[PDB]
């Protein structure tokens, strides 16, 4: 199937408590591979995935250089954001950045990303065409103007369709036995009555990779949102994930309901019935 | 006019005495790096910083050391300088996009002894009576010789004002002693004008050469005059036919 | 910046167009910048390229083909003033700028009225030396270093008198030796047979 590479950087302001905290992390289809913590002692870009420790010193010296730079970059961005939104130097703000490329089965480029967010809100971002930007508001439009003149767009674009993809392809090959595995989720049904006229049926999804999966409930061959609970997909911690769906069922009416599991590690979609 | 500023511009030193070339940048550029350029080797990167407190050695970092405590400055330190560290140094900075802007550069020469330092001998040669009769144009020939190191700026001044039209300064100095490491240098420039102009004895021609030598600080033991940073000139006046 | 940079200093006559083609390695590359540098001066950006195609700017045009992996720069209406070293930039090594082979451009000026000749410049009260000027020869001629070690020659240079729309090439020759004369001055140089020698 397709794949993805993502870079998440986070800068939070600490007025009076020094320099803003910076954290950067990178993934490969939900698999973390590295991270960078401004307040850590190492002061370097560190490994988080086994197949990524085989890279040369040059590699780490670089990544660290760039990431360390970026931190200061956004450190500066924050100082400006204040001015743009005319905010006081007393509060604390947040600046997130999203950088990533997606590839198809053929390993050929499919899509690129590079967006910013201030205080968790959309700021400015690169469009699908990778030729123009999208400014969330008046402030974002002022920076858009500058990057327009700077020809930033075309830079990114090329980087994405280039550097990113090749790096991605390389990681994929380097982490073959791990990244290209497709674990099928293990399933089971649990039953707990809540009253004399009701009971709960939870459909469980265990040990699946990747995280993308769909758990749907049907009453007599019809989907149902009414009286259903859906948890956010959760990480098992050993690399696999978990998630479940529950439905409030009238007692003795357990068999009318069917649980449907959809995941690319499944040849055929699974159906559970108590 | 905002640029990369390198100080100083020119420099002479004895093997050993440490030094530091500063590089200032008022463009708020997060990227700053140093390059050395040598004949036949082109431009080489020594160290580069993507942002403050961020440092990474370039292709040829040995003998060089840097610091990125501030964004505006990116100095280059040479603890124990070597003759082979004699070269043309450049400081670049990039921001918007990734386009870099270069400082005007710094010429450094590491000699084993400052006794090797020599100012230039400037002499100008009057046009050929033959040249005027045949071409009706007059060409003067400025000649700067025996100076070490290769740090000079030549210019022609006519009647008190700088000249450019009709001048051709050699692009690069000439190693008088090609086979010697401490060879002294030489350079020439030409100024061609109307035979009419030259035949006017009221016209004043002066060749000026800027010499970047030692500072009023460095020691001097020799008898000959201290080869300090100075300006030497040579003149000639119009000659009636 | 290794072996097989297109051999020799590109040579091109006045008014023509110059073509600089260079192939690179790191496919990671995705953005290139062209810089022009005059002999003793600092390099200077003159062209920026990012998307696979063409980019124009007056007499300048840079082409980029990431498929074949080649960078190009083209100058229309070449001017002598354009003789310089041109090289491409591309941060690839994970943060640094790598200056691929820099090509040297030589724009032959067009000497409309050739009048090859070697004059003997009047000595100066100040100096002992005697100087011979070989000027007005055609851009077709190449000057060569003297045979004798104490007789120096400078390579051709091009001067332009904008008022008289006249440009002339020229080379200087000087010595303190009594052996030296303007007739034997450039014997080790293939000069026009039509070249003049005064009195």
């Amino acid at each position: 199937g397709s794949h993805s590479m993502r870079y998440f950087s986070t800068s939070v302001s600490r007025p009076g408590r020094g320099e803003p905290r910076f954290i950067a992390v990178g993934y490969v289809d939900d698999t973390q591979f590295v991270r960078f913590d401004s307040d850590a002692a190492s002061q370097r870009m560190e490994p988080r995935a086994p197949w990524i420790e085989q890279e040369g010193p040059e590699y780490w010296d670089e990544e660290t250089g760039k990431v360390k730079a970026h931190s200061q970059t956004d450190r500066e961005n924050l100082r400006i954001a204040l001015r743009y939104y005319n905010q006081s130097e007393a509060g604390s703000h947040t600046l997130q950045m999203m950088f990533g490329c997606d590839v198809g089965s053929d390993g050929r480029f499919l899509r690129g990303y590079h967006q910013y967010a201030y205080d968790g809100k959309d700021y400015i971002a690169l469009k699908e065409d990778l030729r123009s930007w999208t400014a969330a508001d008046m402030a974002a439009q002022i920076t858009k103007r500058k990057w327009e003149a700077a020809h930033v767009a075309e830079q990114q674009r090329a980087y994405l369709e280039g550097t990113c993809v090749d790096g991605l392809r390389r990681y994929l090959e380097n982490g073959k036995e791990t990244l290209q595995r497709t674990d099928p989720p293990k399933t089971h049904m649990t039953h707990h009555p809540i009253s004399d006229h009701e009971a709960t049926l939870r459909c469980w999804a265990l040990g699946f990779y990747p995280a993308e999966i769909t758990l749907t409930w049907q009453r007599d061959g019809e989907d149902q949102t009414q009286d259903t609970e859906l948890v956010e997909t959760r990480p098992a911690g050993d690399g696999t994930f978990q998630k479940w769906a529950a439905v409030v069922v009238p007692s003795g009416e357990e068999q009318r309901y069917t649980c449907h599991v959809q995941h690319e590690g499944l040849p055929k979609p699974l159906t559970l019935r108590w | 006019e905002a640029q990369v500023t390198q100080n100083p511009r020119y420099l002479i030193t004895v093997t050993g005495k440490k030094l530091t070339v500063t590089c200032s940048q008022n463009m708020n550029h997060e990227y700053m790096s140093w390059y050395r350029q040598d004949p036949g080797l082109g431009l080489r990167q020594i160290y580069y910083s993507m942002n403050v407190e961020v440092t990474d050695k370039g292709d040829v970092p040995e003998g060089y050391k840097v610091s990125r405590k501030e964004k505006r400055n990116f100095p280059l330190i040479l603890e124990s300088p070597s003759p082979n560290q004699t070269s043309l140094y450049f400081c670049a900075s990039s921001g918007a996009s990734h386009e870099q802007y270069f400082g005007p550069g710094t010429r450094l020469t590491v000699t084993e002894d400052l006794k090797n330092v020599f100012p230039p001998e400037v002499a100008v040669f009057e046009p050929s009576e033959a040249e005027i009769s045949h071409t009706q144009k007059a060409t003067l020939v400025c000649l700067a010789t025996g100076f070490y190191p290769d740090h000079v700026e030549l210019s022609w001044w006519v009647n008190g004002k700088e000249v450019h039209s009709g001048v051709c300064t050699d692009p690069q100095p000439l190693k008088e002693q090609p086979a010697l490491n401490d060879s002294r240098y030489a350079l020439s420039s030409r100024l061609r004008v109307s035979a009419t102009f030259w035949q006017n004895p009221r016209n004043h021609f002066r060749c000026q050469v800027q010499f970047y030598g030692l500072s009023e600080n460095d020691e001097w033991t020799q008898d000959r005059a201290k080869p300090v940073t100075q300006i030497v000139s040579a003149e000639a006046w119009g000659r009636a036919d | 910046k290794e072996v097989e940079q297109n051999s020799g200093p590109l040579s091109v006559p006045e008014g023509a167009i110059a073509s600089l083609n260079c192939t690179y390695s790191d496919r990671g590359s995705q953005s290139f910048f062209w810089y022009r540098q005059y002999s003793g001066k600092s390099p200077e950006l003159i062209m920026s390229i990012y998307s696979n195609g063409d980019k124009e700017d007056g007499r300048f045009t840079a082409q980029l083909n990431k498929a074949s992996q080649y960078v190009s720069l083209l100058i229309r209406d070449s001017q002598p003033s354009d003789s310089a070293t041109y090289l491409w930039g591309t941060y690839n090594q994970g943060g640094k700028l790598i200056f691929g082979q820099g090509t040297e451009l030589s724009v032959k000026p067009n000497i409309q009225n050739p009048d090859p000749a070697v004059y003997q410049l009047r000595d100066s009260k100040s100096s002992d030396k005697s100087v011979c000027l070989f000027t007005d020869f055609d851009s077709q001629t190449n000057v060569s270093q003297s045979k004798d070690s104490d007789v120096y020659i400078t390579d051709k240079c091009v001067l332009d008198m904008r008022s008289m729309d006249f440009k002339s090439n020229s080379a200087v020759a000087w010595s303190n030796k009594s052996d030296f004369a303007c007739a034997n001055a450039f014997n080790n140089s293939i000069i026009p047979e039509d070249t003049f020698f005064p009195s």
Partner: peptide, 10 residues
């Protein structure tokens, strides 16, 4: 591999 994002000031 992370991108060369330096210089991109708001």
């Amino acid at each position: 591999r992370f991108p060369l994002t330096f210089g991109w000031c708001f």
